Ligand binder design. Structure first.
Ligand SMILES: CCOc1ccc(-c2nc3ccccc3c(=O)[nH]2)cc1
Ligand SMILES: [Zn+2]
Lengths: 162, 47
């Protein structure tokens, strides 16, 4: 039940999503090992992901969380990179999309820095890079990220050396 | 998947060393995220 709607680059919604993508690039402590060496992106396409069932699943949970947290979902817009982006947009997020070995335990991880999520497009640690050239810093191959609506509710604060 | 810490719905990873890094977050229920936008891109080689 998923359809993808292309946004025009002239659309304010395209422009605000692109700005969040570009403005949240940073340098990484691996010198580019996982995600590649870059300061900015060439945005090729932004598509709205439309699925009524998956949206209703989200809003149902959001209401449960809000009701447990003084009517505050604590909703953010956050990046997600994953080899399973196609599965996610069709079937929704679930336990198969978790980072089992993540530093905060087995769960689904999101980033404020788009460049952090870029490190996971080809797998944990960038895996072996793009399927065509085996290059984690490939400048040719098309990558995909998700910009996601995320309910945090009451969030446990972990101070961490990163 | 693990559970959220008792009395919490997510974890926030606050950076404590790299002053330029932004936060990272973890949820333990897939229903707590919706994949709004699919962005197709290339990384650009620095000039
Ligand atoms: C089999 C591995 O599945 C995944 C999928 C996504 C991610 C992932 N981890 C992150 C960790 C910190 C910040 C951002 C991300 C991210 O976008 N995806 C990790 C493992
Ligand atoms: Zn490539």
């Amino acid at each position: 039940g998923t359809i993808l709607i292309d946004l025009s680059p002239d659309d304010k919604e395209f422009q605000s999503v692109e700005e969040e993508m570009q403005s949240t690039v940073r340098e990484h402590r691996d010198g580019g090992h996982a995600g590649g060496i870059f300061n900015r992106y060439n945005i090729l396409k932004i598509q709205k992901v439309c699925n009524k069932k998956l949206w209703e699943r989200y809003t149902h949970r959001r209401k449960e969380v809000s009701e447990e947290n003084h009517n505050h979902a604590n909703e953010r817009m956050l990046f997600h990179g994953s080899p399973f982006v196609n599965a996610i947009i069709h079937k929704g997020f679930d336990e198969r999309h978790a980072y089992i070995g993540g530093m905060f335990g087995a769960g689904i991880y999101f980033a404020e820095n788009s460049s952090k999520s870029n490190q996971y497009v080809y797998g944990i640690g960038g895996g072996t890079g793009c399927p065509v050239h085996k290059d984690r810093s490939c400048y040719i191959c098309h990558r995909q990220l998700l910009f996601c609506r995320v309910t945090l509710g009451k969030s446990f604060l972990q101070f961490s050396a990163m | 998947m693990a559970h959220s810490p008792p009395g919490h719905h997510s974890v926030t990873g606050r950076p404590s060393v790299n002053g330029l890094a932004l936060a990272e977050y973890v949820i333990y229920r897939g229903e707590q995220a919706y994949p709004e936008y699919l962005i197709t891109y290339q990384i650009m080689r620095p000039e």
